Amino acid sequence: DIGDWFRSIPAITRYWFAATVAVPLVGKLGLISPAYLFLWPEAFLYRFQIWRPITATFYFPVGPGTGFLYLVNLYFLYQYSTRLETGAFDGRPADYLFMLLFNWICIVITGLAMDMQLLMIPLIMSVLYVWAQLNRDMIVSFWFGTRFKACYLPWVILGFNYIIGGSVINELIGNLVGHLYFFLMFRYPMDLGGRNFLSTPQFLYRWLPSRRHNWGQGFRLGD
Amino acid sequence: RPNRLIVDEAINEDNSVVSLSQPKMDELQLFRGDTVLLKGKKRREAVCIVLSDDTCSDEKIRMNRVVRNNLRVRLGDVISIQPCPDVKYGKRIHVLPIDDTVEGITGNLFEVYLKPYFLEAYRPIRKGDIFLVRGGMRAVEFKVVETDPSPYCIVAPDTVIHCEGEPIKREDEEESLNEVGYDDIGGCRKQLAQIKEMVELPLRHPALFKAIGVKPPRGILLYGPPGTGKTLIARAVANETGAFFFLINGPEIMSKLAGESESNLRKAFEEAEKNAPAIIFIDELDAIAPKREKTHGEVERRIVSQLLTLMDGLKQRAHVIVMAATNRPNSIDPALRRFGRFDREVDIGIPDATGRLEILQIHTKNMKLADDVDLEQVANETHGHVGADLAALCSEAALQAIRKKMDLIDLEDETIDAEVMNSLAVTMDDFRWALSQSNPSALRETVVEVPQVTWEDIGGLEDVKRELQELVQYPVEHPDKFLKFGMTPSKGVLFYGPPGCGKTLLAKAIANECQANFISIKGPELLTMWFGESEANVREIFDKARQAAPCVLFFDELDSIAKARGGNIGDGGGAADRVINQILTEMDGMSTKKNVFIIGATNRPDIIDPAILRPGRLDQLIYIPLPDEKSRVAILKANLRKSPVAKDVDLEFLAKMTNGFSGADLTEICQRACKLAIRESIESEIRRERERQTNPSAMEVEEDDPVPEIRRDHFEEAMRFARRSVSDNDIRKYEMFAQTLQQ
Amino acid sequence: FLVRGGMRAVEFKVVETDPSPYCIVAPDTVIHCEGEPIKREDEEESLNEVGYDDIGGCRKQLAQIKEMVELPLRHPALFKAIGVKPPRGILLYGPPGTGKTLIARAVANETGAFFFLINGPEIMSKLAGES
Ligand SMILES: Nc1ncnc2c1ncn2[C@@H]1O[C@H](COP(=O)(O)OP(=O)(O)O)[C@@H](O)[C@H]1O
């Protein structure tokens, strides 16, 4: 099961799955230094510190602390990352590759400005929030939930993670950065103007191609 | 607006036709061959061609299943119609099949499905639609997934069809055209009119019944033999009106565990209560709710009383119709008949001779029969079959056409080419073979039908013919003058006369003339429950006649029980009164509103008990006499309906040598005369075949048999071996009884 | 190959030969019949279990069972493609000891199937509601 089902996951998402599961395993046993991944913002303001521009963006010391929190955010991702790929994203992976970088650089710059340490939840809920607005207008009702009306998901989910824990900064920034990107990528071109001045380079398409309907060959006209 | 109309189903398929009345097109600036735009719910558009219809009304438009499915509408809705004859020829069309229809087919689908479909049709197609093609052995549906120019295009003789690619996955908003509908039932024209009338209103417009404040139906009970198509009426009605058919079964409720069978019923009505207007089908009701005396345990007394408390809990809320199916309406618990529960009852009998033909043309629609199959012949010689049996006969005969062609497909591949499938054909040689090893399941069951005997099938006795006509037609066809006066039309007639004179033929003939059902109860059948078995049988037979009104019940050889009483002991004389008492008890209960006619035949009129003959019951005495001369030749003509052309037969000469015989004996004479003629022709061909042993194929002229040349001397020689069946003592006994009754 | 013995049927195995592999036995040849016998390996079915040549007195009835069951069990895919309904229950009836569970054991062993017998007395008497 572990073999084929993991391969059944799309390579882009399966790579995200591998990154999110392998790191906590090393942390719980503790081979590498747990303190080696902290992302000191003040050190960045003084020195470039090319050691950790990316390393602390996937590390999380899950365990006796916020153990339950890591499980759930990974859980909605697993239950909903697959869904959103199937939603208007199968034929455009290069576009779906792009905005993943856009939120990641947006949260870290706001993250480097302030003094938080673990930007784990923001990168999960940002894309999850982007899913909701770009995939609105369905009713969902799970077994232990209520019969809340459609298009309420981004707001009802927003309160849930906020009240469990804290750190008001990360929840607020992740939603608004999705909000502005939702307005910029989707709403801005036909609102006033300012079209897609973020076009993905051909190098991205060269690495991973898009999908086009293969016509094939037409038999004949008949008669 | 002169655009919105009501829709209804068609007959002549033709996935791109609609039937409209002539004045409607005349006033809507429409002309022949004009393509039109049809628009309905969900902003869906279908393009069709219009043509005139003979019997189409103004506000009703006739269209088949496929056009309705594209528009996402149902029966009796409203559509938008507008002429747009400005379509531009398409260039390249990309048509692909649906995934769950081409399992293991492959081959070239273009040249055996699409090629004969678009050829010389100029079909106008629109993007996103679905059409169904009757294949060689299957029915494969396609989906126009791309067109150029988009989306309106008419298929032209110069168009490039790109029919390659993986099949499209089935989406969720379709209704799966390959499912049951109102056109998938035959032989149930009247019953499907009743079910559709009582159900279409509570299920299509639930809101109206709340404002009107009247009581909707809450239970329908269909009964009949197994295999006659009951759970197909419940599946057809739910699929067309739009509902949430939720089947619960008989056996799997009774065998879950201990006390949790009940929690299966309690949570079965829950989905139907929160899932829109629903319909619940409880199959095999007699398995879970039998009579109180056959429930020997306790946990079978818990299920029944759990079914009753759930039915009485259906007071308005959502509209939920619960229908049940049972084999015999006597085996159901009597508590499931009170009002608020199963009250409306429908009967699905076995099909008749014109019904068995319609089941044939439904199941064989997919196959490709050869040009020698006479479906009329197979229909009329399969009495005793139910709907489900004729669906196996048409399958066994299909298997021969591949069993005898197995070499062509020797091990093939995992997928079978479509070219060979369209090359197959089924002949009478297969159908006669599948008929041999078939076991019909109806057999011993009382058949209710309109017999085909005509007046001309009996000769003479026209005075009796007028007499019976007076007592049947006039009381029901012209009742107004009977309404005046306290006239009581006769409820019965008794026939008495010499045996074998044509009593049963008269009762059959009158039923055919009035076009009413006929039910016959024989003598030996009447003594079947006379001993041991209770008199419950004699009850349902009258209820059987009651439901099929109008009908002509027939009691044959009524004096059978009296003869058994007459004997050395006749200990059953009181027992012989049992059946008579029950017959008497259930003969005075008939109402004048329902039209039921009782006819009893007898041959010992002096032995019938005086209790039966009484005013208010069967009381008209009719004496059937032996046919006389000119009438006695008409009996002989009743066997000339065969082909006994005996040269210059001179039937008038044959008339004068046939003096003083009975009725049924004369037909035996023709059969006896014909029997030796068949035998004599055997020696002629036996002589011919053994003479051909000398000459090898020396036949310049093609002739194998003397071609039935029936002779008169051969007929005459048989008549010499004939004796009179008329007994002088017997006819004298009746005539003096006739005079005694006369005077 | 199977050799018919005095009271049994002993089946041997040509495990080694020379010159390999086609070597017809000749009136001047060497046979080495000594050694520990080979374990009965898997895959192949034994040559001693039931077959169509192990029934007699039922040449007609075994013709009806064979034509009705040979097609669904040998070509499972063809019935899917043509889409006709196959047989789904056969009821053999007769006196006990006439060879009924031997007609249903020869059909499985010849067409190729997974004969899975369930018994009457053993199902009926397991335990209360666990049966
Ligand atoms: N017009 C028809 N009338 C009766 N039976 C039909 C008709 N058309 C098809 N059938 C057959 O009836 C079968 C379904 O009826 P069935 O489920 O046996 O009802 P029940 O279970 O009440 O006996 C189908 O297999 C179908 O082949």
Ligand SMILES: Nc1ncnc2c1ncn2[C@@H]1O[C@H](COP(=O)(O)OP(=O)(O)O)[C@@H](O)[C@H]1O
């Ligand atoms: N007009 C007729 N008169 C007399 N016999 C007839 C006439 N038409 C047909 N028959 C023959 O008489 C027979 C009728 O027998 P039936 O009346 O059923 O016997 P029973 O009188 O004992 O009930 C039929 O077999 C039929 O061939």
Ligand SMILES: Nc1ncnc2c1ncn2[C@@H]1O[C@H](COP(=O)(O)OP(=O)(O)O)[C@@H](O)[C@H]1O
């Ligand atoms: N051709 C045959 N016909 C009937 N019985 C046979 C035949 N050949 C062998 N038998 C005997 O029949 C036995 C199997 O019958 P059995 O297992 O009793 O079937 P069932 O239990 O259904 O009667 C075998 O032990 C075998 O000895």
